[PDB]
Design a protein around this ligand. Sequence first.
Ligand SMILES: O=C1Nc2ccc(Cl)cc2C1=O
Ligand SMILES: O=C(O)CNC(=O)C(=O)O
Ligand code: NI
Ligand SMILES: [Zn+2]
Length: 331
Amino acid sequence: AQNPNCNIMIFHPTKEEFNDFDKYIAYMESQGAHRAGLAKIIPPKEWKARETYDNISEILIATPLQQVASGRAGVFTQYHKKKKAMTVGEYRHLANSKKYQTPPHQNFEDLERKYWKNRIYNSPIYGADISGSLFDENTKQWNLGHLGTIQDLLEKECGVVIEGVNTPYLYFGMWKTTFAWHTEDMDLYSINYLHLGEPKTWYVVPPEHGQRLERLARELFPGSSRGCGAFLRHKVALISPTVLKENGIPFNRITQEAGEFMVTFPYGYHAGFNHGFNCAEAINFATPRWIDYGKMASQCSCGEARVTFSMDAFVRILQPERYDLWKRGQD
Ligand SMILES: O=C1Nc2ccc(Cl)cc2C1=O
Ligand SMILES: O=C(O)CNC(=O)C(=O)O
Ligand code: NI
Ligand SMILES: [Zn+2]
């Protein structure tokens, strides 16, 4: 078996290899990339997402989210407090202010140490799930707004036509902004492009070991576990690399820089944080290999997770028992 230790692999496709998205994902998997739960793809030197980022300041962040922590430094939850709307220009200025700016640091490792030591004592503001794209319409390769849709994948594989659409989301981050431990809806893939700014550090558990993370989470957040059989779907729980190591949970880490893609694979739990002001774009996608994961995906039915319009058809078709039971959380 390829990549038996489940290491995060980094790929350098040529411009020719960058033409056929599906084919390259399949190639990455032939080399065992999916075993890690996460891969990095560095685009060919000839490629660009768009010409410049000089004209993005007028984008609106309608509902910036203040990420307030509760718990201990290495085991905490965060809740999202809604703030007043601001433009990307205003958000950038806020990110760079004395209150919110990245502290002096030696390197990525020093910054990581500072993040886990001090994250809970601050409440950074994140711009999340803003529908939109920063890819130029003329960018033909790896344009996250031009991917084949999940609905079309299901139709190609299973012969059923379903309602729903599948569009990208923008994320504007600042120092300490955090993504909690999660897999994607329906255990889909995700692809994430860091358009500009400071790095994003990622942690990932191999899909073959996801249930180990779930078991630890139940132990560390016992009240949350009693409330919902899939509470990680709420996307609020953080566990540090130190705590993962202490509990023998297999995981890896990597830092994504501007101009780089990351792909998460079905049932690859991931979490992470931003180093400073940045902008990323991400979308879910599917392949034939995803279908078996989709049919087995856990679901939140306690009402906390209540997800997109397009998720309905996925549960309805792939998980009819669970759909019937839900009808008898989203509503
Ligand atoms: O939060 C939710 N849990 C669910 C489980 C099944 C279906 Cl069809 C929808 C949902 C939610 O919105
Ligand atoms: O960048 C973020 O804040 C979160 N991104 C993801 O979880 C993803 O791309 O799958
Ligand atoms: Ni994700
Ligand atoms: Zn729930």
